[PDB]
């Protein structure tokens, strides 16, 4: 689906974020560098019910991919309330898990061992 | 009809120069660059200024 | 000739406000600043980030 699905921070409610300014919508990808979506949402009658849910730490499903909102900028100019939403791919949220243990010394590792060490006992389902 | 051209040439005197303030432009550019920098820092975990 | 005035008024209704994008301006400014920084670095040998 080409529209955006909005799931709240507490995952209690999941709906469709309508009346998105698709002209301002943009999807940026760069290998090993970035993966994000940015757009602007105006509060209208159609999305007034769920316009309060779209905020930081909310989840947006777009083309089958999940993006966590990392920057929300509500703005009020007269009668129009607009939020500038920037969301990064959920993979980068893996930075919330830290491996405190250290394998001291110089040693020849492979990618498999380092990856297993990095994502050991994850609580975020990675 | 002469005073029609009177007003037309009087208001042709208008300077075709619109001076735009540089300070606000610089501040907006700085804010957008800061947004980009924060995005890049987030993509690399925390291996940056913060 | 009344509809001349009607149409000209309807077209005067237009807002004389042209919004210009800020992200594009910021990116262009950043690219130009990068060009200047690279020039200065080259003129200083390699005593810079690269």
């Amino acid at each position: 689906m080409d529209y955006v699905i909005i799931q709240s921070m507490d995952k209690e409610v999941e709906e469709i974020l309508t009346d998105i300014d698709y002209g301002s919508f943009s999807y940026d990808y760069e290998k090993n560098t970035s993966r994000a979506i940015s757009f602007t949402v105006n509060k209208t009658k159609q999305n007034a019910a769920i316009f309060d849910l779209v905020g930081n730490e909310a989840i947006l499903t777009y083309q089958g991919q999940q993006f966590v909102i990392k920057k929300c900028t509500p703005k009020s100019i007269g009668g129009t309330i607009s939020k500038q939403i920037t969301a990064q791919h959920i993979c980068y949220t893996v930075q919330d898990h830290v491996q405190y243990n250290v394998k001291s010394g110089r040693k020849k590792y492979s990618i498999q061992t380092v990856l297993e060490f990095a994502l050991q006992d994850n609580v975020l389902g990675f | 009809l002469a005073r029609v051209e009177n007003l037309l040439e009087r208001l042709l005197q208008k300077n075709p120069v619109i001076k735009m303030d540089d300070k606000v432009v610089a501040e907006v550019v700085s804010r957008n660059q800061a947004n980009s920098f924060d995005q890049y820092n987030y993509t690399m975990g925390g291996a940056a200024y913060s | 000739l009344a509809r001349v005035e009607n149409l000209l008024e309807r077209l005067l209704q237009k807002n004389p406000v042209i919004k210009m994008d800020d992200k594009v301006v910021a990116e262009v400014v950043s690219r130009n600043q990068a060009n200047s920084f690279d020039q200065y670095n080259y003129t200083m040998g390699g005593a810079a980030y690269s």
């Binding site: - | 208001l11 606000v24 | 000209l8 005067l12």
Partner: peptide, 27 residues
Amino acid sequence: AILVSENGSNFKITVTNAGELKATKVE
């Protein structure tokens, strides 16, 4: 004829202001 004059005067007077909004601030 006079209406044409007044309309042109007001049109150029309004045109004088111009826009160039950054996001919401002027220039």
